[PDB]
Design a binder for these strands. Sequence first.
DNA 1: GGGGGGGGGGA
DNA 2: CCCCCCCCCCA
Lengths: 56, 56, 56
Amino acid sequence: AKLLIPQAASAIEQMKLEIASEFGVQLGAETTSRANGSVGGEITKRLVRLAQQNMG
Amino acid sequence: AKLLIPQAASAIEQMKLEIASEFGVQLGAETTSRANGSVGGEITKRLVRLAQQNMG
Amino acid sequence: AKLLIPQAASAIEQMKLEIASEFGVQLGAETTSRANGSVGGEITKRLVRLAQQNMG
DNA sequence: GGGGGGGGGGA
DNA sequence: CCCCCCCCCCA
């Protein structure tokens, strides 16, 4: 799960737990894919949205 | 083809065209889906990276 | 790629293959976006036709 | 495995 | 809407 910028590990980590509770999902191997994936989906969606903001 | 932040359309377009040149691919109907697709993959990668950077 | 109705996956899959054959198009990354796209166009066309028929 | 963000098409 | 891609991230 390496990132482009490892120094951001802390950042995403916060946003991760944030989105988790929002959708009400428990990031664990005992959970479905559509559940663990929905999180990573929102994370990417937000990172993109922010980047598009600092360019508009 | 609505973007998350349509106000960035012009910025992402210039990014698209510049990446196409750097990649040597000529965007178009007659281009392979792989070549066209690669430009879109770079946009997301760079946007995600820039987000992580200017954040964490 | 998640279709409106995932359960239709198998059916659209067969229609796709049958359309590819009629068109003489080989679906793939190295195939032009136009050739690949042509197939998706027929699929939507036939689906809309079926819906208009079984609707009166 | 999944979700999301982009690229190029066709109907 | 469907087709073919590429990328990011979660697990």
